[PDB]
Amino acid sequence: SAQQELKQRQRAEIYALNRVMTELEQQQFDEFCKQ
Amino acid sequence: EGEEY
Amino acid sequence: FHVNKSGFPIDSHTWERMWLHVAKVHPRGGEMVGAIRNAAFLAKPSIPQVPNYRLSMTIPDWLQAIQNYMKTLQYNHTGTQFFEIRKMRPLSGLMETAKEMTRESLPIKALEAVILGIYLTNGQPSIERFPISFKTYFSGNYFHHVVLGIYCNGYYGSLGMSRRAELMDKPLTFRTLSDLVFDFEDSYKKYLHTVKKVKIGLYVPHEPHSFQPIEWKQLVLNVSKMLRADIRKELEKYARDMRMKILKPAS
């Protein structure tokens, strides 16, 4: 189904994005602590 | 930065 | 600040608003967003199995398995909550949303973890569940956070999700509600957060088709304005009422 493959690509993109923002949130935190 | 949660 | 109210698959307007947000907040925003959305192929993330309670499990084992499932779904850092939680809805609808979370298997925030922790412990009648909410202050802004308080066999603990490890799950080893709540306050101290309000709800019924909503604010304490001994007195009185009387919902 067209719907099911769209939900899978969206899930793959969400998890890739979630990794990037988790990494960003981490180095922003370390950036803050050293100041 | 803001500390969320 | 955004919430997916369009179901699954996520619709275009909601989808674009997610990407525009992360494009704005991320320092290499445009380059990074284009990298994901244009990727020829992306690996399908593994789908964790929903934990099932087993006779080989202790209660702490079960809670740990639930908590590990939640950690595996991951805390949602995208700026877009994926499941709409209307806190005032009847439990039955909130439980439907919780099933939906186990089907779509996406990242979740604190409020959704609370709903999912209720769903996943509805089968253990000796585990009592009640929301604990915090309004904190940090450098010019207020923050709201919520976890799922747990009472079992005389001990307190919690399940939940947070950006911070110390602001979610707590082992079932706190002898009083105060010790639990005070452990959260001391954990917030690590991150320079001052706790302004603490809000304790009622025990959530185990009936998955309940017409009743969750009571989130049975007890509300302005702890930033209180000395610690009076906070302890107030929480102990309240927690003793939870364990004995059946209280009228504050609402």
Domain regions of chain A by residue span = 1-35
Cβ neighbour number for residue C172 with a 10 Å cutoff: 20
Cβ neighbour number for residue C15 with a 10 Å cutoff: 17
CB–CB of B2 and C145 under 8 A? Answer: no
For residue C9, say if its preceding peptide bond is cis, omega within 30 degrees of 0: yes
Domains in chain C, number: 1
Q: Does C108 touch chain B (CB under 8 A)?
A: no
C79 conformational bin, left if phi > 0, alpha if psi -120 to 50, beta if neither:
left
List the chains bordering chain C where 3 or more Cβ pairs fall under 8 Å. A, B
Which chain B residue's Cα is nearest to A33? B1
Which chain C residue's Cα is nearest to B1? C139
CB–CB of B3 and A31 under 8 A? Answer: no
CA dist C17 → A22, A23, C59 (Å): 19, 21, 41
Q: DSSP readout, chain B?
A: -----
- Chain C residues with CB under 8 Å of B2 CB are 138-139, 141
Residue span of the structural domain in which C117 resides = 1-251
Name the method of structure determination: X-ray
CB–CB of C138 and B5 under 8 A? Answer: no
Å resolution of this model?
A: 2.5
Identity at A8, one-letter amino acid code = Q
Residue of C197, C196, C134, C191 whose CA lies nearest to C160: C134
Distance (Å, whole) CA C89 – CA C159: 21
